[PDB]
Every structure is written in C-alpha cells, then in structure tokens.
Design a protein around this ligand. Structure first.
Ligand SMILES: *[C@@H]1O[C@H](CO)[C@@H](O)[C@H](O)[C@H]1NC(C)=O
Length: 115
C-alpha cells in the first residue's frame, strides 16, 4: 500500500549502531519486509513480518519491530559490520494487496582499521 524511508543515505563507522527508519501506510493488517541489495547482486529478503511477535530477527544481527501505534518498521543492528554497506529497502503488503517498495536507504560503513 505505502512505505516511506525518510533517509536516503546513512554513513556509519564499523562497530556503531544503525537504525534505518521506515514508515508505512495501511489501515488493515500489514505484511512488512526489509530487503537488502549488495553490490553486483539482486535484492534479497532480509526480514519479514506477517504476524505474531512484532520484533523480528533477520540474518546477521538485523532486527525490526512492527509498531501499529507508531505505524513504523524501523530496522536496527547493534554493531554494524563493514560488509553491511548496501542499499536497504522497506516494503509493505497484505492479504489482498501487492508488494510495495520504499525509495531505499544507502548505508555506507567505514571499516575499522588496526595494526
Ligand atoms: C513510538 O513512539 C514513542 C514516542 O517516541 C516511543 O516511546 C515508542 O517506543 C515508539 N515505539 C516504537 C516504534 O518502538
């Protein structure tokens, strides 16, 4: 139905937290998703919410919470890895609805360098 990703880009150092904002529009029961696009590959599903517990855990430390009250589906990760650089897309759906995508959010991760 409708999804909004208010930030187009995010720059962050390896080790720090990350929050990618997503707002949705619907009235019914929404099906929510996060997809990730790594360089030189197609979209992949990162996490999804259909029902039950609003906090959903996806691959590699990624988390998202469905909030009906706040009508949000913010994605978070406690400590980002350098390989997390990518474009993240929020999408929404429903019982008799098509899948709709947001404009996406580019995440640039600065790698941590030691000696
Ligand atoms: C909804 O927003 C309120 C006010 O900032 C906040 O206290 C609450 O935790 C939010 N719910 C979500 C999306 O976690």
């Amino acid at each position: 139905q409708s999804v909004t990703q208010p930030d187009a880009r995010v720059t962050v150092s390896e080790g720090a937290s990350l929050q990618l904002r997503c707002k949705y529009s619907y009235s019914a029961t929404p099906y929510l998703f996060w997809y990730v696009q790594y360089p030189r590959q197609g979209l992949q599903l990162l996490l999804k919410y259909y029902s039950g517990d609003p906090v959903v855990q996806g691959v590699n430390g990624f988390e998202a919470e469905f909030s009906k009250s706040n009508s949000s589906f913010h994605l978070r990760k406690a400590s980002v890895h350098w390989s997390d650089s990518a474009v993240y897309f929020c999408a929404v759906s429903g019982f008799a609805s098509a899948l709709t995508f947001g404009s996406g959010t580019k995440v640039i991760v600065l790698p941590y360098i030691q000696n």
